[PDB]
Structures are given as C-alpha cells and as structure tokens.
Amino acid sequence: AGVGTVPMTDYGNDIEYYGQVTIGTPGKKFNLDFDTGSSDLWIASTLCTNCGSGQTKYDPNQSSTYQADGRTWSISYGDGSSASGILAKDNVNLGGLLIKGQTIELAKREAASFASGPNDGLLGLGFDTITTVRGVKTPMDNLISQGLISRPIFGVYLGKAKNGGGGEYIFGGYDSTKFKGSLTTVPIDNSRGWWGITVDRATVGTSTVASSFDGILDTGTTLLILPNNIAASVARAYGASDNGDGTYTISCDTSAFKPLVFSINGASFQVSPDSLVFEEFQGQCIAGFGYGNWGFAIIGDTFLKNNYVVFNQGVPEVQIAPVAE
C-alpha cells in the first residue's frame, strides 16, 4: 500500500474496523481499533494481569527504543469498558510513517470485553484536548509536527461485511475511487475535543423525523445513537420496537424500507435500507440506530460505512461523499 495507507479489517457485521500498527524496535504488529471518539493510544502489555491470552502484548524488554515514564493513566469509555496502566515512549509505524517517540499507554488492567475482542488496544483520533493525561500529543499531532504528512488530513473508507468488508485509512491523503460525485465541506466544532457537526434535518420518504441536531463522528461506535425524541421519531417511521436497552427490534426484510436521509450542509447523506439492520440473531433483527440520554447524536459506523470522510485536523473541517458501491 502507498505511504500512510492502512488496510482495515471489518470485525463481524461491521462492528468495528481495525488496522495493524508496528510499535518498537525491531517492532511488533498490533491490531488497533481506530477511534475518532477518543485520543489515547493504549495497548495490552506484559504488565497486564487480566488481559486476553489471544491479545498481542507489548513487551518493553524487547524494544530497544522503550523509554520508561513516571505517569499512570486510566480511561473509561461510553459503553462502560475501561483500562488503566502506565505511560511510556516508543516509535510507532503508521502505514510506513515512523512516528518517533510517541507516548503509548501500556495496559496493566482491562475490561473483559477488551480481553475477549479482536483488538490489542485503541488508536485515538479525536483532538488532544481530550487525552486523559495532560501534555500528551496524539499520533496526528506528531505526524504533522514531524512532517510525516503535508496536509493535516486522513481519508476514511469503512466497508460493508455484506460486500466483503474491508476498509482503508490514508494519513495525509484520500482516495476518490471510494466515493462518488463531489465532496461537501462541513465545518467542525471541536470545542469538546470531538469531531462535531450539525445535521440540518433527517427525513424518511417525505416525513421530517428530525430537525437540526448536533452529532459527533465516531469511527469507534457501531450504531447511530440518537437523542431519545429523534430516536423515537425514526423508529415510528420504520415500525421498530424498543427493547428497553438503547436498542430496537426492526423487521429483517429491509427491501420495503426507505433510506434515512441526512441533510448536512446542503447535500444528502444516507443510511441505505440494508444498514437499518445491524444484526440478526436467531431470526430477530436489531436496528442500526439506537438511543441514548444525550443531547447530541453519535454518528457511528452505521452512517460511516455509507459515506466517505476526509478528516482535516488543521481547519478543522471534514469533506463527505457517498461511498462508491
């Protein structure tokens, strides 16, 4: 792959996408979940006492470039998972781009869900205002400042398990074979350390299920999680029923449904009918949208596997376009 190109792996039914990162000298390959909703780079280490045996573990002793650090860290995600450990410094190779002396966070403890998943840790791609430890420069900060990328951007392509899965991240460039038409520039509000946008409205057919709302673009969240009222309004349009846990039961046959269309800055972005169904387990289908007790939405993979995004950290802004499929 070209410079800064990282081929992704689609886990399950578009649950998550992870790529290979080489850390240390001589270096080991790690499978990290690329997350635009967090800014801490953490990995399973040999200091970990409740880590998966299936996970690949960073071993300080085998990296001739490891530098010890006196600080500790602890994190807690929105789905309730967590991890904690110590800070350190080493080299990280992101698609042929060698980031020298990056602050990596080595896990001493991790939630079981982490221990049982396909990931060795996470790559945080949100702004540095939300790093859990103050003064830590995120990978994107180091690429820029080390001149590894000329444009302060990353192009994101998330594939669909139904079409073979895959995905691709490109640091400092993008790929037009992956999208159709022209890109639309949308300004970003990073005042909370996230990639925040304003959706002008949402429609199902001719009905306005929602008016403007704010959402964060999170590559690390599976569904489209919407405020309670918006969520309920969408559900009524599809005849989905509330499971009482942030999820909905929808009909497995989406052939009859209309796409959920989002009017963002003048253009139309959608959640195609197939995408309205997340998973089917023993004949019951769980919808691709959920609800949370938040005032903003979490624009997760359900949406991203349908639209190509160019994340610009410098302005900041994003450029979006419908996936070529």
Partner: peptide, 5 residues
Amino acid sequence: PFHXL
C-alpha cells in the same frame, strides 16, 4: 455494538 468517550 461498541461505544468508544
């Protein structure tokens, strides 16, 4: 489903 902060 995941829900990464």
